[PDB]
Ligand binder design. Structure first.
Ligand code: GTP
Ligand code: MG
Ligand code: MG
Ligand code: ZN
Ligand code: ZN
Lengths: 424, 38, 41, 94, 61, 42, 97, 291, 62, 62, 401
RNA sequence: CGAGAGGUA
């Protein structure tokens, strides 16, 4: 009495390690013509915390009828719609429907005609809204639809949503207003997915599936790519030169701010007081001694790191000025799909601060040039000119970025800093 | 190696069962969220 | 002279010197030398 | 049955044609030909599953002609266009 | 195989390895460079503070 | 039928103890491929 | 303060040093930063409250959002017998004893 | 409401190369024609082999795979039937409607290296002789000895599977853009900026006229739809200087064949196959509607 | 590099300035033995024992 | 390793253009001029004709 | 003064400029390394001696400020290993990905196995049908003059989304390109048995000597070596018999080796890797008629998800693609063309853009594409370039349990 | 049956 596996049966899927109860999800078996591989919806990768790069999923097949009955009533996907860790939604659009929704809600200038709208309606559960755009030119027929009405076909007619932070107003299933922010689409306290789940909780999965299909079709119609113009982060050569000079001056100002902040100790209380001191020039004449004094202490190093980050936030804030609206990296950073602003800064303008949090027997020469490596008195050569030293906390700033290339000393510094990163 | 606490883990705590499969997983947006492609 | 050799000539000489070094010693020479020294002496 | 006729009860004058063993090369041209007719309101096709070779075509018409009539008229017009193009190519080659 | 002539190029090795291995039981064995401390340099350690003189051949530390 | 190594000669020996090539001295033999029709899908 | 390995607690010694300056230090809020000796100085409830606050701070620093009920349940489960036992086998054995 | 009336004009026509212009039609029709001619036009190719002597340095499977990709003349591809539907046949060996037998035999008895090309591949039917372009397609190289004897058959197949029955070679089509020049904002630009604007175009689309000292349009069908001149004009301060828009009812085709069938015959076969598919769909729809 | 209890390597895991031109400071085996195994550079040579005596030559220099 | 036939991405038969390419390279011609003389306008076929390595010679020798 | 002459010291050659002017004499010649060492043009410097002398990095800095650069380096890319110096734009990529590429992906690549497989009976010998050398050139590779440093094939790779089938660092390849012979490799597995019982059939594919004939398709439950017991193939053992080797030692113990070969076509779950730490598994096989073809009809063989770049932080693969496209595309003067991709001597981005512009394409590497399903023209250009990829030894059918 | 080294998630 043993029949072969077919459609409708439930299996208990799991991905090692099982770090939380949502790794056990009961799914219905669907037969596919493929072989030696299993497939699932990419949105469902979040509960498993797994990618698609060689990750293997091992499943369990119940045999007794009672185990099958209790499997889809407690361990099924529709029963795990609420995350038990924080009370929010468990399933969310992973970076793809997210990117497509951000693009379709931010542009507001790429109208869709009747044919494309009807083609995209096949993947939406609800009907078609009015075009709302009858004429856009004095000699333009064929009234078109707007981008924000395309996303409004995913909401039920009786669904009301309001997100004041992003100025999002949803009334009668229609998206009325949206300014910016890309926060109501990601996972959060007031995301639209959570409100939909709290509204009906009966067809949320179908809505998510239809939205994923429609947004994938729309993105295929548009197309997203990354080219060298995204990494260049400039319109022409003059803009690139201006950006390079601005980055250099910002790094110099950040270093000066760090050196100024390093003087907030008890040894300089006589200098910090409002009096007459003749040693004002000596505090700025010794520029190379500040690095050695910083790398030999821990509290000073932490204060320097904090000051450098505070002064480098403004430096990172230049990509929005020197970047275009159609920048793929900027779009993916604003939408919260993949990456952040700092990664773009390291890609285009400058890597920034590179420091290790372990005690080593060598330091950084603060210059990262050919002359700095050949200096006998540099901190990299064991001791910074002797009174001797025994340990150092490395602290260096790389002016170059990953696009313009890295010097061998800069690559050595980056490797030393990044050696501390390891899962195992 | 099978001694002490490792013996307990390999015998009583951790066990191997039948009717199981293990394969590599790929992406397929055509399937539903609650469906697995076998 | 001082700078009459040129820049490209030095690059070509560096490439030729690297080629000669790879032709003489090769990628595996240290192990061979260590084993030969253990037999002869 | 290669092509199946299914009627929609919620929407008047609506039909869903499921064509088996088809691809985009036929659905796209059928959809583009259906838009030329004035009586066709909604015309589109989709391929929900690449592994299952099926094409679903949805046709909405007014209260003047049936969706099947519009589908047949579009097919006949496309065949006539193909014949005209073949004749033009034959005349051009010689 | 060392200093082989032109007749050995058509029969024998595949001309893809320099031959830095050993054949023990049909398997290739490779030695890895073992990094050891220098025995010809004065070594100074801390906790406790001491200076040691390494032994060259016999234990005369 | 078995082909020898550096020596060109067919041993054609099926005995359990016969593993050494005749008049050659080496004990390495390669099985010869006969004329058999095999089909492949291109 | 240096770790007093004797029977005298560091809090009691700190109270003796601050005799000349008592009104300036608010003793209605001053508490040891440690969790175990706080339960002996002020009581098990104060130690539990400080433990909950530290757990919330650690969760916030970890970058994750955890509901209050889980942390409260952990705090109440780790202080059933009026003493914060360790997570090793000795603490579990003592709690069961 | 009714059918369209496309226009076809042929610019260049050769045995394996054809470039014709299609006008008064939609993009979908051209895309479907391209897909049919690149994936649905059937040809003849070697799919099953039978090796009995093989002592070369290459594996038998590699030789079979490289033999199955040799182009063959497919003038009878439309009339031939598929092996799956050949009722009055077995499936293996020389057939009358589905399979054609091929024989190959090579033996090297000289000191020099013998190259087994595709010219010494004989078949029973003279109408299926492989296309000869030259020395032929190299199959294997033989040293002194190393005989190779092979027997293979060829069947009719669609180009959808194995990508070896497809006769098309990157069949393309464009929209034939029309270049619009204001001819009034160019007078503001000096002679130095005109050279910079000309050099901005990756291809030779805009030329400098010496007698009139202005820019003209030469070979308009080489713009490649790359936003280079428009971006340069916007950077220089002229936003609406050059406006380029793709034409929807005009197309320029470029059909390249692998030598199996002629390009004009390839287009005719693609049209016939599309018509047959439409007729089958119409018959299915009529059967569903009538009953 | 032979280190007892490779689980806690300590300092001998990170690249050193003495690794300039001798061993690769950018390619190390990720895992438990990270930093212990070091790949030699292309221009890497290992000195052997000298057979001749340099005492007389050194005394001849002054 | 003989030349990859049929230009995997392009679809053009390029199996008979290796001897001609070698003959052109033997004369005073560069890779670009030799590829242009063989009428290869797409860079896919040029890459296929340029990235191929002749390995069958060593197979026949050794 | 500290002098060392013992063994175990690591040395490297460096250029000395004190007698570098002596080089310019009898210009056309191939310099032996021994001649240069004897004449003092080059010397070996230890780790302790290097910290005392001043050494310049490049040769351009030497000509700027001489007399302070008594020592000089030949090439900065030689500081890395043999598996790391061959990687283009090594300093442009992140350290973690360059480490992965130099450690794991180089070892797991499938390339040249050997030219004499008849004398080797090693287990799991994998070989690719059509190995291809990379379009870009590296100084280390040029000096070594070995094509075995690169194991893989290069394909036209486009950075775009394809119906969401390439999500979660997945890869979508072209069905038509794989069926023509791309990324097709063979696997030869050898089975060994020792006899001191004798070889025999003792009562389908076995011959009278106890071994199957060459050319027999072996499956599960079949005997590969017969002894009289016999050794049978397991559940995941299959292939075609290639050769049978019999050998014995001086002790009289006979040995038998049988090799089985099978062509490993790219399956749906196969894992592939790049030269910049980009690793992912195949997600979907798409027909050639459904790809976003360009104006000239070149369809992308591999489509990768754009979301991997902003997170993995691997810039240089795009630079490699642009350089390869510029090299491959025709010019409508091929001499003096930028082809080298030395890690520490990479050409500037402006040079790459100019080279690609002179070839007739866009300066940023992106080209206008047309949808293969509907025929409409996409709004945004897609970046395409022939990057060099690798195939890893991990297969989908080797993980089924 | 164990033991030793590498690798995958
Ligand atoms: O030691 C481990 N213990 C454990 N429970 N899991 C684990 C351990 N080591 C590795 N893992 C698993 O590996 C992945 C790491 O993710 P990875 O490298 O496969 O993908 P990404 O996205 O992180 O990196 P890239 O390749 O750049 O895309 C962990 O999730 C873990 O489960
Ligand atoms: Mg990943
Ligand atoms: Mg993973
Ligand atoms: Zn012999
Ligand atoms: Zn027949």
């Amino acid at each position: 009495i043993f029949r072969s596996l077919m459609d409708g049966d439930t299996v208990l899927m799991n991905r090692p390690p099982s770090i939380h109860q949502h790794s056990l999800i009961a799914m219905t078996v669907r037969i596919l013509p493929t072989t030696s591989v299993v497939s699932l919806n990419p949105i469902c990768c979040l509960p498993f915390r797994g990618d698609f790069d060689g990750d293997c999923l091992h499943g369990y097949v119940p045999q007794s009828i009672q185990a099958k009955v209790e499997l889809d009533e407690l361990v099924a996907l529709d029963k795990q719609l609420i995350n038990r860790q924080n009370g929010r939604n468990l399933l969310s659009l992973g970076q793809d429907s997210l990117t497509a929704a951000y693009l379709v809600n931010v542009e507001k200038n790429c109208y869709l005609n009747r044919a494309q709208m009807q083609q995209l309606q096949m993947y939406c559960p609800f009907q078609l809204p009015p075009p709302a755009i009858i004429k856009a030119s004095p000699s333009s027929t064929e009234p078109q639809w707007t981008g924000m009405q395309l996303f409004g076909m995913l909401f039920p007619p009786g669904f009301d949503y309001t997100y004041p932070l992003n100025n999002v107003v949803v009334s009668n299933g229609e998206l009325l207003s949206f300014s910016e922010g890309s926060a109501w689409l990601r996972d959060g306290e007031g995301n639209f997915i959570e409100r939909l789940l709290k509204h009906d909780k009966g067809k949320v999965l179908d809505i998510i599936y239809s939205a994923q299909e429609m947004l994938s079709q729309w993105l295929l119609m548009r197309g997203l790519s990354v080219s060298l113009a995204d990494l260049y982060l400039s319109s022409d050569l003059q803009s690139r030169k201006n950006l390079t000079e601005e980055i250099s001056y910002g790094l110099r100002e950040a270093e000066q701010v760090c050196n100024k902040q390093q003087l907030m100790v008890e040894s300089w209380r006589d200098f910090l007081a409002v009096n007459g001191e003749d040693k004002e020039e000596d505090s700025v004449s010794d520029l190379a001694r500040f690095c050695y004094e910083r790398q030999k202490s821990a509290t000073l190093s932490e204060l320097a790191v904090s000051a450098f980050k505070d002064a480098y936030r403004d430096v990172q804030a230049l990509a929005y000025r020197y970047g275009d609206q159609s920048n793929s990296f900027l779009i993916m950073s604003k939408a919260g799909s993949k990456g952040n602003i700092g990664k773009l800064v390291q890609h285009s303008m400058c890597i920034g601060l590179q420091n290790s949090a372990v005690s080593l027997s060598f330091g950084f020469p603060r210059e990262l040039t050919c002359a700095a490596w050949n200096d006998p008195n540099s901190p990299l050569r064991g001791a910074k000119g002797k009174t001797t030293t025994e340990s150092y906390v490395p602290y260096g700033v790389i002016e170059n970025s990953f696009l313009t290339g890295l010097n061998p000393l800069e690559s050595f510094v980056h490797s030393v800093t990044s050696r501390d990163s390891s899962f195992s | 190696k099978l001694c002490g606490l490792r013996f307990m883990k390999d015998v009583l705590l951790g066990k191997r069962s039948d009717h199981t499969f293990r394969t590599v997983v790929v992406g397929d947006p055509s399937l539903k969220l609650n469906e697995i492609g076998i | 002279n001082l700078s009459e050799l040129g820049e490209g000539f030095l690059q070509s000489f560096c490439k030729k010197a690297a080629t000669s070094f790879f032709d003489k010693y090769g990628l595996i020479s240290h192990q061979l030398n260590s084993y030969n020294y253990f037999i002869e002496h | 049955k290669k092509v199946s006729y299914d009627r929609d009860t919620k929407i008047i004058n609506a039909a869903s044609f499921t064509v088996e063993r088809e691809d985009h090369t036929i659905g796209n041209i059928v959809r583009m030909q259906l838009h030329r007719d004035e009586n066709v309101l909604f015309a589109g096709y989709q391929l929900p599953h690449p592994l299952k070779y099926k094409i679903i075509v949805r046709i909405h018409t007014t209260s003047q002609s049936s969706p099947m009539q519009a589908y047949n008229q579009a097919i006949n017009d496309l065949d006539k266009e193909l014949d005209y193009l073949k004749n033009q190519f034959e005349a051009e080659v010689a | 195989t060392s200093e082989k002539g032109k007749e050995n190029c058509k029969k024998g090795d595949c001309a893809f390895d320099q031959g830095g291995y050993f054949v023990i039981k049909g398997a290739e064995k490779v030695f890895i460079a073992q990094e050891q401390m220098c025995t010809k340099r004065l070594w100074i350690s801390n906790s406790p503070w001491t200076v040691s003189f390494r032994s060259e051949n016999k234990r005369n530390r | 039928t078995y082909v020898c190594g550096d020596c060109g000669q067919e041993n054609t020996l099926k005995s359990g103890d016969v593993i050494q090539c005749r008049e050659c001295g080496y004990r390495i033999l390669y099985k010869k491929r006969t004329r058999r029709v095999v089909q492949y899908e291109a | 303060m240096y770790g007093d390995r004797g029977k005298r607690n560091c809090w009691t010694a700190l109270l003796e040093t601050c005799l000349p300056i008592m009104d300036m230090i608010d003793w209605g809020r001053s508490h040891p930063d440690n969790i175990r000796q706080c339960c002996s100085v002020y009581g098990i409830d104060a130690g539990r409250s400080i433990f909950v606050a530290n757990l919330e701070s650690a969760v916030s620093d970890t970058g994750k959002e955890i509901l209050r009920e889980h942390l409260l349940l952990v705090a109440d489960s780790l202080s059933v017998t009026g003493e914060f036992v360790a997570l090793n086998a000795k603490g579990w054995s003592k709690q069961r004893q | 409401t009714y059918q369209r009336f496309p226009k076809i004009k042929i610019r260049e026509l050769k045995d394996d190369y054809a470039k014709f212009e299609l006008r008064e039609t939609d993009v979908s029709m051209a895309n479907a024609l391209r897909r049919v001619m690149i994936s649905e036009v059937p040809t003849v190719a070697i799919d099953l082999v039978e090796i009995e002597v093989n002592s070369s340095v290459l594996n038998d499977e590699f030789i079979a795979h490289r033999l199955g990709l040799i182009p063959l003349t497919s003038e009878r591809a439309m009339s031939m039937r598929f092996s799956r539907d050949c009722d009055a046949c077995d499936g293996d060996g020389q057939c009358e409607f589905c399979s054609v037998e091929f024989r190959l035999s090579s033996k090297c008895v000289t000191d020099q290296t013998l190259d087994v090309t595709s010219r010494d591949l004989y078949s029973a039917d003279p109408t299926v002789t492989p296309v000869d372009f030259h020395k032929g397609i190299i199959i294997v190289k033989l040293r002194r000895g190393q005989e190779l004897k092979l027997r293979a058959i060829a069947r009719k197949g669609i180009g959808k599977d194995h990508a070896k029955w497809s006769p098309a070679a990157t069949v393309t089509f464009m929209y034939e853009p029309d270049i619009i020049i204001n001819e009034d904002m160019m007078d503001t630009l000096s002679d130095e900026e005109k050279i910079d604007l000309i050099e901005s175009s990756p291809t030779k689309v805009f030329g400098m006229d010496p007698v009139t000292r202005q820019v003209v349009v030469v070979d308009p069908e080489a713009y490649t739809y790359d936003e280079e001149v428009i971006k340069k004009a916007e950077a220089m301060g002229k936003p609406g200087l050059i406006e380029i828009s793709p034409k929807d009812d005009s197309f320029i085709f470029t059909v390249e064949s692998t030598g199996a069938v002629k390009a004009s015959q390839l287009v005719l076969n693609a049209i016939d196959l599309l018509k047959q598919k439409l007729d089958a769909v119409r018959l299915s729809d009529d059967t569903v509607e009538a009953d | 590099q032979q280190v007892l209890y490779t689980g806690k390597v300590g300092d001998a895991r990170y690249p050193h300035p003495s690794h300039w031109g001798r061993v690769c400071f950018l390619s190390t085996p990720d895992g438990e033995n990270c930093g212990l195994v070091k790949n030699m550079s292309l221009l890497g040579l290992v000195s052997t024992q000298s057979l001749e005596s340099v005492v007389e030559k050194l005394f001849a220099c002054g | 390793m003989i030349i990859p036939v049929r230009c995997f991405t392009c679809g053009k038969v390029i199996g008979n253009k290796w001897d001609q390419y070698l003959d052109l390279l033997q004369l005073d011609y560069t890779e670009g001029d030799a590829l242009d003389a063989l009428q290869l306008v797409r860079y896919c076929c040029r890459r296929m004709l340029m990235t191929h390595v002749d390995l069958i010679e060593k197979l026949l020798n050794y | 003064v500290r002098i060392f002459t013992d063994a175990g010291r690591l040395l490297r050659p460096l250029l000395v400029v004190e007698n570098l002017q002596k080089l310019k004499q009898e210009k056309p010649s191939q310099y032996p390394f021994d001649h240069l060492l004897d004449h003092g043009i080059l010397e070996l410097i230890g780790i302790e001696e290097e910290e005392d002398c001043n050494t310049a990095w490049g040769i351009k800095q030497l000509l700027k400020e001489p007399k302070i650069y008594t020592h000089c380096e030949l090439d900065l890319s030689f500081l890395l290993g043999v598996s790391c110096a061959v990687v283009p734009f090594a300093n442009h990529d992140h350290g973690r990905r360059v480490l992965y590429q130099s450690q794991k992906h180089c070892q797991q690549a499938i390339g040249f196995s050997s030219t004499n497989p008849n004398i080797r009976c090693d287990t799991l010998s994998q070989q690719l049908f059509y190995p291809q050398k990379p379009l870009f050139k590296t100084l280390a590779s040029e000096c070594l003059k070995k094509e075995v440093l690169f194991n893989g094939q290069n394909a036209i790779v486009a950075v775009n989304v394809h119906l969401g089938y390439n999500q979660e660092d997945s890869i979508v390849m072209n069905k038509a390109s794989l069926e023509r012979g791309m990324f097709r490799s063979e696997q030869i597995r050898s089975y060994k048995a020792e006899v001191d019982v004798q070889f025999g059939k003792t009562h389908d594919s076995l011959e009278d000597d106890g071994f199957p004939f060459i050319g027999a398709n072996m499956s599960t439950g079949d005997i590969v070596i017969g002894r009289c017991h016999s050794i049978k193939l397991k559940h995941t053992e299959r292939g075609i018999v290639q050769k049978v080797v019999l050998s014995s030692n001086d002790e009289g113990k006979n040995f038998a080796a049988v090799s089985l070969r099978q062509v490993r076509s790219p399956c749906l779950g196969d894992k592939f890797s790049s030269m910049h730490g980009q690793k992912g598994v195949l997600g979907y096989l798409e027909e050639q008629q459904n790809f976003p073809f360009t104006i000239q009809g070149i369809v992308p063989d591999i489509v990768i998800n754009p979301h991997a770049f902003p997170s993995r932080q691997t810039p240089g693969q795009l630079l490699e693609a642009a350089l390869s496209k510029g090299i491959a595309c025709p010019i409508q003067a091929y001499t003096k063309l930028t082809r080298h991709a030395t890690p520490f001597s990479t050409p500037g981005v402006t040079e790459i853009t100019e080279q690609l512009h002179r070839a007739g394409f866009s300066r940023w590497g992106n080209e206008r594409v047309y949808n293969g399903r509907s025929g409409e023209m996409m709004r945004s250009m897609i970046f395409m370039g022939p990057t060099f990829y690798q195939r890893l030894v991990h297969m989908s059918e080797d993980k089924v349990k």
